[PDB]
Amino acid sequence: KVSPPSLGFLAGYGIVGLYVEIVLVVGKFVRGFFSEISHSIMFEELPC
Amino acid sequence: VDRILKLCQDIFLVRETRELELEEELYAKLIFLYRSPETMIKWTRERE
Amino acid sequence: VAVFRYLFWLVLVVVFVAGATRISIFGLGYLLACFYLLLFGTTLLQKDTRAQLVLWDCLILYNVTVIISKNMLSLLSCVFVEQMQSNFCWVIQLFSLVCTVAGIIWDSICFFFLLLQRRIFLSHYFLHVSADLKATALQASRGFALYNAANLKSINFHRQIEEKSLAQLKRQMKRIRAKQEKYRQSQASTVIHSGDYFLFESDFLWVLGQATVDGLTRWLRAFTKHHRTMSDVLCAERYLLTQELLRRRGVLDQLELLLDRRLHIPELEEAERFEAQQGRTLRLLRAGYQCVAAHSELLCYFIIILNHMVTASAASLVLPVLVFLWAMLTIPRPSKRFWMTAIVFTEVMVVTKYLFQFGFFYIKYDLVQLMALFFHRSQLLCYQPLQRFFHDILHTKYRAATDVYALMFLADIVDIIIIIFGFWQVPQAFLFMLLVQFGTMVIDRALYLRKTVLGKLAFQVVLVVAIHIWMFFIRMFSQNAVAQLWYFVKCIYFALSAYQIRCGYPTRILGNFLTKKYNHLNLFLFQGFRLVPFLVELRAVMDWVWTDTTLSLSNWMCVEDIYANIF
Amino acid sequence: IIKCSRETEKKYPQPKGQKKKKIVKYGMGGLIILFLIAIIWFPLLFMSLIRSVVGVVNQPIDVTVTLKLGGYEPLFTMSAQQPSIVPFTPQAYEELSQQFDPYPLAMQFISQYSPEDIVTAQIEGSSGALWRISPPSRAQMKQELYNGTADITLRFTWNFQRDLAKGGTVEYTNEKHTLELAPNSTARRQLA
């Protein structure tokens, strides 16, 4: 047969890597966005 | 931190008994506590 | 005791194996005899010696007839080339007429075992053993009453514990209501924005192995303690009855709860001392045998799923499904109806396998099921709208009602680890089964958070039937071996879930489990849980989604983060 | 933004009655959860699909064989073109299967390479061209073959030329088969 060489950096070493970095960075961004929001309440609980 | 732990546990238990008419009051007390560092210092002294 | 009491089951096994080993249609008699004797052995041993002697004489007559038939059939076997070759092939497959030159060793071995057991039947040892079996048959109702007393006492204890817990909850609730109303009166002289300081008023190497095995056998004894106690009291009672039996319940009062207050018999004390003397090398194996006898039921489930899992994916899979829906949901006793249906299914399947094994138109795995089911049935030794009636029984809310939720979550997590490791098309289906597993996680959390039970039953039945019919799409031994372990983990998850269904979701089940004690281990596990991405925020969002509250999403997240930090 | 939030709260003031925005709840959490399920499912899906490949067979359009002796000249060389290249029909594939049915390795090796993946060239043995030989070369051939007790070897080689529309990376794959002969032996004698 013939298979396209687009596989290149296949899973286990290359593309799986790139995936794991991007998932860690997005997870850290979301966790910082959702968890850190306690310190600022002095600036949002403003009634008037 | 015993007072605040008791407060949060009270929030959770008043939640688990489906009396929603105290959850707002308890949350208001907690948010006011975290709205002013002077009170949290006043609220976290050491027992004798 | 081994020779005079545990040999009849062995000869039954020998008859079965001889019938199975020979494929020709002469071991069909061996299989039918094995089934009949395995069913009727208990009632057979209690009858009068003449009956058994005649029956086993009939059996040995069958044995000699079959061996003589094979001997005379060897003649046509060795004249097969002229006539029987390429003619009457159905009969040559039926009788399996083949020359020798030995090959009938099993039949002679069974004949020998038959004569040996007949000689055992003649002995007086079998006479008093039959007396002992009669006593054991008699004491069944007393054992049943003892078991009922034990379980009712346990249920009452659990009820009282739950009652005191609810009393404490009511006391806490009164306290918090009193505090809030006192604050209201103090302030008498949206609402979330409200809040003021007035709420804050201050008002040498062998010993290592021997000790380890001693610890193991002590753990086994601890696991078996209840069975040990009831077996000991029942056996002491039976011993005194048979000592009394020369030729009502009042005679049993020579001495309900697990009470040892009674007189003593020196023979039993000496026997206990002697079995303590023999703890050098058989202690661990005796403890293991006592454990498998005391439980005697979950290993039936073990064998049933191993046989359904080991190469019998074609037609065995129906029978575990019944288990998951019938044995372990109805009543703490799956009972006689389930056991008879399962065993008749196994017997019919093995006889169909034997008939379809011939050329006119397996045994190793199933014989284990047969012996296990018969052994468990012997151990028990006590006995259209009905479907809707049983469904109603499934929703009564009268059980111990305990909740164990971390267990199936951990089982699902281990299943995810197995599915991830199951790579080094099945890999293509791995993605779909992974996603549906995540969906099952979400929906079982949904079901749990609302304390629903009937929805849990519907989820259980649909999930098990789907995951079992999914084996129509199931290298086979090398690569397709992680999948069977994954299915076994699904089984343990199903067992936990259906046990939870039987229990029934106790009230006051909320909060973070890991935050039960403020120890170092709980801290470390809590941080480890917080270190896995896309779990804690999802768990907060989902708990907020299914629970009934008042705070907008951000307020819920704030409270959860606050609780975690202060914890 | 805080003031605008306060004003929109004033516009529709929800009562003390709790009900926590049930339906809106079901919407918002739903969107959130799908997004969370969405993102991670994508680079797995994209991870897997980018790895899926169709087993498109590459059948060589042309084949060439040559038979050369010594380092002097090719004695013979054929090239079966289209009609001498028979791809196996499925039926030929089963035929190859039963012929090598007892042997398990043969069955797995055939089971991998589909009938379209295995072809046969009907090289025309006798349909040659003139084998020109420079007479110097011929004479030295004969003299060495007759008295030269050296070792002379063939250079028999096969090349497969691929479709080049069906890809195939290098499309002139070939292997050489050089096997030494025996002097003072009837093989060299009959060749001479």
Ligand SMILES: CCCCCCCCCCCCCCCCCC(=O)OC[C@H](COP(=O)(O)OC[C@H](N)C(=O)O)OC(=O)CCCCCCCCCCCCCCCCC
């Ligand atoms: C690597 C794994 C290995 C596993 C090995 C497993 C075990 C293998 C060996 C098993 C051998 C079993 C032999 C059983 C023989 C039974 C004989 C038997 O029951 O005879 C009974 C005899 C004959 O009747 P009787 O009393 O004269 O009757 C007249 C009248 N009633 C009377 O009072 O007279 O009456 C009697 O009173 C005679 C009693 C004879 C008792 C003989 C018992 C032998 C037991 C041997 C056990 C061996 C275990 C080995 C374990 C090895 C483990 C590694």
Ligand SMILES: CCCCCCCCCCCCCCCCC[C@@H](O)O[C@H](CO[C@H](O)CCCCCCCCCCCCCCC)COP(=O)(O)OCC[N+](C)(C)C
């Ligand atoms: C595909 C072509 C072939 C199909 C073949 C289908 C064959 C179906 C045969 C079904 C036989 C069912 C036998 C059931 C035996 C039950 C025995 C009984 O003892 O069990 C009771 C329990 O019975 C169970 O509840 C019955 C459950 C029935 C469930 C039926 C599910 C059917 C699903 C069909 C799905 C089909 C999908 C499509 C398939 C192609 C125990 O009750 P118990 O504890 O003593 O009650 C205590 C109170 N007492 C003292 C008064 C008695």
Ligand SMILES: CCCCCCCCCCCCCCCCC[C@@H](O)O[C@H](CO[C@H](O)CCCCCCCCCCCCCCC)COP(=O)(O)OCC[N+](C)(C)C
């Ligand atoms: C790493 C951990 C260590 C384990 C590693 C694996 C080791 C595997 C070892 C396997 C152990 C096998 C245990 C065998 C248990 C046999 C039980 C059988 O004999 O039960 C009989 C009863 O069986 C039932 O009647 C059904 C028929 C079953 C027939 C089984 C025959 C077994 C023959 C064993 C032969 C062993 C040969 C070994 C050769 C080396 C007798 O019971 P009975 O005295 O009525 O009991 C009355 C009271 N009850 C009912 C409450 C128990």
Ligand SMILES: CCCCCCCC/C=C\CCCCCCCC(=O)O[C@H](COC(=O)CCCCCCC/C=C/CCCCCCCC)COP(=O)(O)OCCN
């Ligand atoms: C290839 C590796 C993938 C990662 C493997 C990690 C292996 C770790 C092995 C053990 C982890 C077990 C610990 C977590 C178990 C928590 C058990 C539990 O209590 O369950 C709930 C479960 O938590 C949730 O409800 C949220 C999770 C459920 C939704 C699942 C989302 C989909 C699954 C994601 C798996 C992860 C995906 C990448 C892999 C990382 C982790 C597997 C949380 O506690 P509560 O219910 O508060 O306790 C109540 C006590 N009565």
